[PDB]
Design an enzyme around this catalytic site. Sequence first.
Site, PDB file in Angstrom:
ATOM      1  N   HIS A   1       1.733  -6.251  -1.462  1.00 14.80           N
ATOM      2  CA  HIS A   1       1.188  -4.893  -1.765  1.00 14.80           C
ATOM      3  C   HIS A   1       2.262  -3.804  -1.898  1.00 14.80           C
ATOM      4  O   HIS A   1       2.062  -2.802  -2.596  1.00 14.80           O
ATOM      5  CB  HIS A   1       0.049  -4.420  -0.852  1.00 14.80           C
ATOM      6  CG  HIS A   1       0.430  -3.810   0.485  1.00 14.80           C
ATOM      7  ND1 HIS A   1       0.404  -4.540   1.680  1.00 14.80           N
ATOM      8  CD2 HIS A   1       0.703  -2.526   0.851  1.00 14.80           C
ATOM      9  CE1 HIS A   1       0.689  -3.742   2.700  1.00 14.80           C
ATOM     10  NE2 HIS A   1       0.878  -2.517   2.231  1.00 14.80           N
TER      11      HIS A   1
ATOM     12  N   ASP B   1       0.134 -11.879   2.004  1.00 14.79           N
ATOM     13  CA  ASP B   1       0.670 -10.626   1.524  1.00 14.79           C
ATOM     14  C   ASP B   1       2.223 -10.758   1.587  1.00 14.79           C
ATOM     15  O   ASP B   1       2.884 -10.207   2.445  1.00 14.79           O
ATOM     16  CB  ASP B   1       0.101  -9.473   2.378  1.00 14.79           C
ATOM     17  CG  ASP B   1       0.326  -8.123   1.761  1.00 14.79           C
ATOM     18  OD1 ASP B   1       0.916  -8.050   0.693  1.00 14.79           O
ATOM     19  OD2 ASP B   1      -0.031  -7.103   2.383  1.00 14.79           O
TER      20      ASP B   1
ATOM     21  N   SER C   1       4.475  -1.597   6.753  1.00 15.77           N
ATOM     22  CA  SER C   1       4.258  -2.777   5.924  1.00 15.77           C
ATOM     23  C   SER C   1       5.540  -3.383   5.406  1.00 15.77           C
ATOM     24  O   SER C   1       6.379  -2.660   4.839  1.00 15.77           O
ATOM     25  CB  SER C   1       3.390  -2.467   4.706  1.00 15.77           C
ATOM     26  OG  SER C   1       2.100  -2.232   5.228  1.00 15.77           O
TER      27      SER C   1
END
Length: 199
Positions: free
Chosen positions: A39, A78, A154
């Site tokens: 992402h 991810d 992230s």
Amino acid sequence: EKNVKEITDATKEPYNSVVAFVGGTGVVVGKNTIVTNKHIAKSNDIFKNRVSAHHSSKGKGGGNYDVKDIVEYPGKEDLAIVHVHETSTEGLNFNKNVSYTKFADGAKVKDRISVIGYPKGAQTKYKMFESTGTINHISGTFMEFDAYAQPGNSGSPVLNSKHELIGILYAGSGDESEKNFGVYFTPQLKEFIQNNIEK
Ligand SMILES: [Cl-]
């Protein structure tokens, strides 16, 4: 755990392997090659920002580097590889300015870990923070851990006590969070990553 500390100078290992994207974090594993979330890589491809090698508040700047290509992990995890062009627009060499973090080849529940990245990077002028916690659950390519994290974490590498790479943060429970989720690198994921390191 909520135990965090600014890394004011990120010129030494393993801090010099961490990278800032405009909205997330990644870690360098080899020549021109960063591991981050899928992402983060994708959002960064909307704005096409460069990657900042180990940005921190003090210490010599490591350069900003243009993204060359992205390889997404085919599965649900991810996870993505971001390749950079080696030479910055100032003549800095990406490889001379980072370190290549080695693989932990797994971890165990109750191990103490660190998560290193750029929580709230846009608001802090991308200060680097290390946050400590424990791995509470591992199953296949998933792990759960309790190091404090915020948006901007992230893609953050999750390191063991010998600064080796266990996996990367991708999501939490919050946003803002003490129960976080990572992609835990099994042999299959280590193989995908190592096959995508530039030769
Ligand atoms: Cl250089």
